[PDB]
Design a protein around this nucleic acid. Structure first.
Ligand SMILES: [Zn+2]
Ligand SMILES: [Zn+2]
Ligand SMILES: [Zn+2]
Ligand SMILES: [Zn+2]
Length: 108
DNA sequence: AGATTGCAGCACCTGAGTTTCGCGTATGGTCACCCACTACACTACTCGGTCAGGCTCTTACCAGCTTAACTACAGTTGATCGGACG
């Protein structure tokens, strides 16, 4: 919506941003080499609250997305969708007019 | 010097210029969520080479003979070869 009208000034940086706090998040993270959210359970650190929140689940068994078929736990919707698509007849015969459909790619 | 009258002084209701304000309307700004793309390391089924098993084909025969060619003996002549020349 609103136009990108805050330009990073550093040598060899191309980026422009919508609102000045975001330009500052970029500058402190990329160019100065500082981060604002530390893991309690390992050495790593993160640039956003949502990124530390994802990393915190990785230290735990009670992972926040749970499979509808097998009940395996995962941390975000992309992982869930890819995993659940393995519980489907995903693959299709690529050859002309052939009707068949398959569950594991080596079968196809 | 009184009957007629104006000045103008008192008080209280009122009006605008000026101000402060509330909202619309709309605009830049915070920040929280969750999505897309990327990617190092991984999961797992198939293909592929190799091997055995054991069923399978096809050979060619023994000494002799009897149909078939070689395989040695044998003689004057080549032209690379040694090793020395230019
Ligand atoms: Zn930059
Ligand atoms: Zn950690
Ligand atoms: Zn599952
Ligand atoms: Zn097919």
């Amino acid at each position: 919506n609103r136009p990108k009208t805050y330009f990073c000034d550093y040598d060899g940086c191309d980026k422009a941003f919508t609102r000045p706090s975001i330009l500052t998040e970029h500058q402190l993270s990329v160019h100065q080499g500082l981060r604002a959210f530390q893991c309690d359970k390992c050495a790593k650190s993160f640039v956003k609250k949502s990124h530390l929140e994802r990393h915190l689940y990785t230290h735990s068994d009670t992972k926040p997305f749970q499979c509808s078929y097998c009940g395996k736990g995962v941390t975000t919707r992309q992982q869930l969708k890819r995993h659940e698509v393995t519980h489907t007849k995903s693959f299709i015969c690529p050859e002309e007019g052939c009707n068949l459909r398959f569950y594991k790619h080596p079968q196809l």
